[PDB]
Design an enzyme around this catalytic site. Sequence first.
Site, PDB file in Angstrom:
ATOM      1  N   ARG A   1       3.556  -2.591   1.305  1.00 15.98           N
ATOM      2  CA  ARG A   1       2.903  -2.816   0.042  1.00 15.98           C
ATOM      3  C   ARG A   1       3.794  -2.242  -1.057  1.00 15.98           C
ATOM      4  O   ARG A   1       4.170  -1.063  -1.003  1.00 15.98           O
ATOM      5  CB  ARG A   1       1.559  -2.077   0.041  1.00 15.98           C
ATOM      6  N   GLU A  39       2.176   2.027   2.995  1.00 15.94           N
ATOM      7  CA  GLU A  39       1.219   1.491   3.970  1.00 15.94           C
ATOM      8  C   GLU A  39       1.846   0.417   4.852  1.00 15.94           C
ATOM      9  O   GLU A  39       1.311  -0.690   5.021  1.00 15.94           O
ATOM     10  CB  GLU A  39      -0.028   0.986   3.258  1.00 15.94           C
ATOM     11  N   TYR A  81      -8.103  -3.949   3.581  1.00 17.45           N
ATOM     12  CA  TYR A  81      -6.836  -3.749   4.273  1.00 17.45           C
ATOM     13  C   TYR A  81      -6.681  -4.654   5.499  1.00 17.45           C
ATOM     14  O   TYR A  81      -7.662  -5.090   6.091  1.00 17.45           O
ATOM     15  CB  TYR A  81      -6.731  -2.266   4.678  1.00 17.45           C
ATOM     16  N   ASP A 108     -10.331   8.813  -2.424  1.00 17.64           N
ATOM     17  CA  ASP A 108      -9.380   8.646  -1.339  1.00 17.64           C
ATOM     18  C   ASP A 108      -9.115   9.875  -0.480  1.00 17.64           C
ATOM     19  O   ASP A 108      -8.849   9.710   0.719  1.00 17.64           O
ATOM     20  CB  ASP A 108      -8.060   8.118  -1.900  1.00 17.64           C
ATOM     21  N   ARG A 116     -10.326  -8.167  -3.714  1.00 12.13           N
ATOM     22  CA  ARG A 116     -10.163  -8.024  -2.277  1.00 12.13           C
ATOM     23  C   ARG A 116     -11.254  -8.825  -1.558  1.00 12.13           C
ATOM     24  O   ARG A 116     -12.199  -8.266  -1.001  1.00 12.13           O
ATOM     25  CB  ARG A 116     -10.173  -6.544  -1.897  1.00 12.13           C
TER      26      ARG A 116
END
Lengths: 385, 385, 385, 385
Positions: free
Chosen positions: C211, C196, C320, C69, C286
């Site tokens: 979130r 976020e 996302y 990240d 996801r």
Amino acid sequence: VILTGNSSLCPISGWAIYSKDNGIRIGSKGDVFVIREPFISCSHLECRTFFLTQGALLNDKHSNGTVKDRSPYRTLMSCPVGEAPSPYNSRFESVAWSASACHDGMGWLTIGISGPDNGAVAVLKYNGIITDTIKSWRNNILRTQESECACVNGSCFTIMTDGPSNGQASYKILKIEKGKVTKSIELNAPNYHYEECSCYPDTGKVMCVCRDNWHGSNRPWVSFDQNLDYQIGYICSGVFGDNPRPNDGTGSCGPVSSNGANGIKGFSFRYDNGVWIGRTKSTSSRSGFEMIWDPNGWTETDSSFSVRQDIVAITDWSGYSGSFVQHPELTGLDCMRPCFWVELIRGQPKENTIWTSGSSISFCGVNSDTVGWSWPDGAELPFSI
Amino acid sequence: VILTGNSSLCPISGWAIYSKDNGIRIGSKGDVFVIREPFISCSHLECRTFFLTQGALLNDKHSNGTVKDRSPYRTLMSCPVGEAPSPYNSRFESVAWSASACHDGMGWLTIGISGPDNGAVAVLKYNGIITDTIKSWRNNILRTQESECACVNGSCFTIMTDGPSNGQASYKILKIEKGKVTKSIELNAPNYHYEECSCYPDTGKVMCVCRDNWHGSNRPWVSFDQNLDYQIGYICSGVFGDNPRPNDGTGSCGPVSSNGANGIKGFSFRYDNGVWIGRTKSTSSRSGFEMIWDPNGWTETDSSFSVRQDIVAITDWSGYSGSFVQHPELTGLDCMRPCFWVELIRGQPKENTIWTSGSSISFCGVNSDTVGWSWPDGAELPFSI
Amino acid sequence: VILTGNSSLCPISGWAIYSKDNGIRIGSKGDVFVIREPFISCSHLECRTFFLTQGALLNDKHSNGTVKDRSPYRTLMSCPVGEAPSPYNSRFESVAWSASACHDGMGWLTIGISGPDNGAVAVLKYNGIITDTIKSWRNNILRTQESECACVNGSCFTIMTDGPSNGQASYKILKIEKGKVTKSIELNAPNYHYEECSCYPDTGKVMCVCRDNWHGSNRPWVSFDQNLDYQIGYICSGVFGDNPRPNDGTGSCGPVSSNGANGIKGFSFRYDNGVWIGRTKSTSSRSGFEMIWDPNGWTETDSSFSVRQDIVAITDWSGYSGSFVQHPELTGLDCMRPCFWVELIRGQPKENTIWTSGSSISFCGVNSDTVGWSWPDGAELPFSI
Amino acid sequence: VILTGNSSLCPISGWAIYSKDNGIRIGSKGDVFVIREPFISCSHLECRTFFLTQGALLNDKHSNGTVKDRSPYRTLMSCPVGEAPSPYNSRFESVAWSASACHDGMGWLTIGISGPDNGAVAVLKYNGIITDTIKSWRNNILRTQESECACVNGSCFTIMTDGPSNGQASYKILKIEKGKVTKSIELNAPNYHYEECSCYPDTGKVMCVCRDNWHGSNRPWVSFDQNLDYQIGYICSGVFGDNPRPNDGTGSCGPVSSNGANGIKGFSFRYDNGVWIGRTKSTSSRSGFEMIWDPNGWTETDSSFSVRQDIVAITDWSGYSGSFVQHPELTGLDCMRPCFWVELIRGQPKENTIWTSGSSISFCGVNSDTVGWSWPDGAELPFSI
Ligand SMILES: *[C@@H]1O[C@H](CO)[C@@H](O)[C@H](O[C@@H]2O[C@@H](C)[C@@H](O)[C@@H](O)[C@@H]2O)[C@H]1NC(C)=O
Ligand SMILES: *[C@@H]1O[C@H](CO)[C@@H](O)[C@H](O[C@@H]2O[C@@H](C)[C@@H](O)[C@@H](O)[C@@H]2O)[C@H]1NC(C)=O
Ligand SMILES: CC(=O)N[C@H]1[C@H]([C@H](O)[C@H](O)CO)OC(C(=O)O)=C[C@@H]1NC(=N)N
Ligand SMILES: CC(=O)N[C@H]1[C@H]([C@H](O)[C@H](O)CO)OC(C(=O)O)=C[C@@H]1NC(=N)N
Ligand SMILES: CC(=O)N[C@H]1[C@H]([C@H](O)[C@H](O)CO)OC(C(=O)O)=C[C@@H]1NC(=N)N
Ligand SMILES: CC(=O)N[C@H]1[C@H]([C@H](O)[C@H](O)CO)OC(C(=O)O)=C[C@@H]1NC(=N)N
Ligand SMILES: *[C@@H]1O[C@H](CO)[C@@H](O)[C@H](O)[C@H]1NC(C)=O
Ligand SMILES: *[C@@H]1O[C@H](CO)[C@@H](O)[C@H](O)[C@H]1NC(C)=O
Ligand SMILES: [Ca+2]
Ligand SMILES: [Ca+2]
Ligand SMILES: [Ca+2]
Ligand SMILES: [Ca+2]
Ligand SMILES: [Ca+2]
Ligand SMILES: [Ca+2]
Ligand SMILES: [Ca+2]
Ligand SMILES: [Ca+2]
Ligand SMILES: [Ca+2]
């Protein structure tokens, strides 16, 4: 703004380096067009490099056979001066295997000749819109400057040739206004040969210095006023300007037959009875480049000259060269600034690659200190393909 | 808008990261110039990164031998701050193996030195048009800042050097207006050595902090007014600024001879009798980077200082660094904002690749919270070629 | 022009496709950044895609490890909407591993957080000039929206979090005027978790949907006026919005603990007591994307809803998502247009590549006919490297 | 400036070459989109090439399967005329597997159809903002021009079809003002078939020449005024315009059934009772291209014609063709200038590569000298992938 074109050439002592695009070195890795016949031209706001692509990139199989002069794939494109010519930074101008372009202060004129050798057609555009066409009148490779046309007082001027490359051909001056041909005249020039003229404005008139491919190793010239009243001659200096050529000797104001066949595009600037001659350093191959100031060389036939400034060493390949000007409207000066570019040809026929291309360098005349050096292409041939 | 240059440096507490181009990481796959000697400079409207290409791209055979400092292929080019320097996003400025550039509020001045070591010529351009030239006066590698010149009240100022890198040379301040040299003066600086000055405007005058390659491990400085009335000295702090250098100790207001030979381009900002020093973390190699605030280090010789902010860890390569400013006309502030860039050199001579290049990071001074970290080049060498 | 932000959301019936960049498919061959956390934001004149690069391109060894990240190489950059993010078409914004950006009608605000996990610093820029900094106040991964901030009446608003990802953390609203923080407030939200946030302007106030990574499978929200007077809650619908989540069931106006740990950035638009929910199709991975209209889902806990519109099939990877708006000043409408984007994540951890990146699609709300389909990433993994 | 569209077609004698992009030749090495269905359209200021990408580049594995007409990856994009379509020079317009675009003098309208075959939706944008949508009314591949719409007096006009490709379908004329449909009408055209119309403005009305894929080897046409009062027919000339087609013979003012099934997008320009027909040279394959002037071919059924101008030789691949105009507002002329483009398709299904793409050429009508030649694609297939 229309460019007046009424100023005289600036006084100068030598040539300061203006640009170097390193196009072939860069094109080893990057996506760079295979080109030849590059030239620079300016507006009142900026300078651009024009060039004839081969419709292909370097280090690719479509570069095969690109020594060949004419095809349906060749296109006139342009990019900013000093940048490598890529599909990602280049504007499309016209479909062309012979070209000219210039800016009148209000818009760009481009001239692009394409079509078959026996019936080619020049397409004229102004601001990118087709404004006229001119068809071949001798049916034998209609062709033009491969450098900038000259603009004076809202009209632009060029030279076109049609006919043999090895004997008498036909030569016309064209006057163009907003992309439309408004006047033309054929040169009455038996025993002369004109190709690939380098033409500049000076004091409301135009001077062109050209290539005799038939039988002259000195360069022919043609000058004219806005009405196309013209004069013709050859540069008299025994500092011979073409390639190939003899060793320097006694010149002529007509064509010098010795080593006169074949040739290379080039240029010269007249100052009074003197001349700045750009030429290859070799008498036999397209190698090296130098600028020579001959203070009586426009009209006198001796081989004496006063200044030589090195541009490319004789051990490195050169190629075409041409004039360009920067007008007062661009520079803020009170005189017409003379500049030139040199094409640095790599590949065929002198080198064992499948391809031929050129990179470019350019210089401007200054009345301040300068230096001779060598600024060659610098690519390491062959490439991966 | 001419930039007034009359404001004083903004009060600051530390350095906020402004840009990182990741050029070398990107050039592992993309089409990115081999460069070195990058620098940032701003107008009243935008900031640009300038750099000296090697006329070649990364991950290509023409990158071979690019540890070499000077060649006919090197060009000064520019791109937007924080972008990888590519032929597809870079403007051509000049042919150059040493350079400077700056904007006076109305147009860009660029200075590009090319030609032979024994007779180099600086070509000055304003708005891209050649406006002056300056020839080598000692015939021994004429050279300049490799960072932005400083503009105050419509004139711009730079320093040029000619002569030995390992003994007494000659140093001149130049005043330039719309690209023309209007005044110059030679520094009377026996026993000093000036190279690669980092020069900024402050309160209507200019301060330059430079590199002594002869016999100083602290940095020389020169300040001057618009008339070129100057003062000279060395930074007195025992927090020595050059690379190589001895361990911190007792400083001098003249050159510190210990490990004085050789050097690196760098910068410092004077605040009162204090100084912000940017330096490598290593005393022996071009490794790491840090900013140190020494509240009496301009004029006092102790090795005590108050703040250290990490920029690049000692385990990672750094390189040249230099000052740039953002004027009130750009920022809307009432003070002159100090900033700096760091070049992160990869390849030769420290890594045994065929090539040498650099990426860049930059920071601006703020009076708000900041943090030390390491933002190194991050490329994984060698590449495919 | 300052954007007034005083209009209410346009009435809509569904979502029309606006863009698809095909970035990863293109990056198989072309020079495309490895990215993640893309988002769209608009001015009164144009729309841009912002994204966090990994300082590396696809199909290159520097893409190794890019599931990670945070690093010193990540940068916030932007390009035109619908274009693949390349070094040749992208503007540099800030050095950042977490970001936000928005336009107030006069200029772009960008917020870029970099530095160490224990002391990160957000750098605020307005028109590309640093205007403020904010340091971590809990020393545990200072982080922000990864989508556009919201502008109303010359001020822009964002949310930042600092503290644990798996327990109570600290959440602040920031008010920013020309890039300077002019007010802030900490949410008094024990038992909530905000990360976020997807924030939009509506009728002079701001709504954010966020979130909960700690213990909620429904989404938390925070709304506030220009003075930062706020309200907090969770979306009540039993149509649960996070990923992972339970099967649809009875909702809560506080955090739904079942499958509450972990999460994904997302968004929702409130219309009266109803809500448009964007969510993955899978409850566990996801994968897929759909828009659901639940006419009482803002405030009522049933699992009934009235419209579902397919966006990405469950057999394809998603990622996302976030809100963006088009203001009346851009569109000429009398209402605030709601839009959204979806990031389509490829590579690690779900696929066996050395790398992780994302492409993007986007849609705008219309009161006219629309259709459900699947517009997935479409890249064929792995690549050559 | 709204374009008046009140002028009549310029008198012409032939077609001058305007552009050639060499896209596929360039894409052998560069980063060039896989495309098909290119078309040119102009504003009062410039001309652009629009095209349907396949969301992939040439010489890459994602080009596999791109003979396929419709997918979620296809996007409408645009670049300057004559440039290779690359991710580095192309603007994103819409997500689309069928499209049209045109400029009304104030802004660009784009129409992009995506979604499933049984329920596709056209997204209309004006200045890049979604302004309307139109859903499939027959649930069988809603589709449009694949060339420019026509603008007259502030409104723009297009044709859409929905229904079978091999039997009677449904055809509608749409009137669009600032991107909103303001009127439509269904053609009462039993026994006609309309697809892929090439539509131009002329004397305040619009003329469209289209493709009958069902049972006509001549081309259908539809003309209409600003109120959508229309007339319909087929081009009567025995110089048959579609591909495939029979040998030239006796024509019909209704559909010519011989070899009527299947087809190719094309165009024609009506002058009085005469017609300029662009067609393939082959009767059976998409090979060659020529322009034919038939002075009575709009209304009379003989196979006699007066002028043939070669464009692409029968030994080389051609493809779709379409009309575009340059309005007086762009050219400064007092008449509407007719132009056309040709798509040169390479790859599948005629060549056994993994991919299909097209390059383009274009011409404009002039009343000055022109020449026939062949300007084919020129790429050497296959590539590396
Ligand atoms: C790569 O650069 C080095 C310097 O770092 C050059 O010496 C190499 O030049 C080549 O080898 C030398 C010995 C000489 O033969 C020269 O003519 C060669 O070009 C250079 N390598 C290449 C391939 O240019
Ligand atoms: C290349 O395109 C063709 C169609 O022209 C596809 O069928 C190929 O798909 C692959 O092979 C089929 C049989 C099926 O297994 C599918 O899942 C595969 O992807 C396609 N090739 C590739 C590698 O995608
Ligand atoms: C139109 C054309 O083909 N012109 C030729 C030119 C020509 O052959 C000679 O001048 C003899 O006529 O020579 C050369 C040359 O390198 O000598 C290049 C030019 N190539 C191009 N312009 N494409
Ligand atoms: C003009 C020139 O070649 N300048 C050199 C510079 C120089 O050698 C020292 O200052 C000693 O004089 O050193 C370095 C260096 O990395 O130390 C790079 C510079 N390279 C370039 N600017 N190209
Ligand atoms: C700042 C940071 O590293 N944020 C993370 C984010 C985060 O780990 C969770 O929200 C838990 O706090 O999760 C994810 C994620 O994919 O879940 C990506 C983000 N990556 C980046 N923004 N770079
Ligand atoms: C919408 C659609 O798929 N249109 C097809 C078109 C169509 O199949 C025929 O006109 C029969 O209806 O044919 C062709 C074709 O090359 O013949 C290409 C078009 N492809 C694209 N526009 N993508
Ligand atoms: C390359 O060009 C030459 C010269 O025209 C030609 O004869 C040869 O066949 C070409 N090679 C290929 C593979 O096309
Ligand atoms: C790639 O990244 C992984 C994970 O951090 C690392 O351990 C591995 O060493 C990397 N490979 C190379 C060659 O750098
Ligand atoms: Ca000759
Ligand atoms: Ca002489
Ligand atoms: Ca030193
Ligand atoms: Ca001290
Ligand atoms: Ca959760
Ligand atoms: Ca409900
Ligand atoms: Ca490449
Ligand atoms: Ca048919
Ligand atoms: Ca007839």
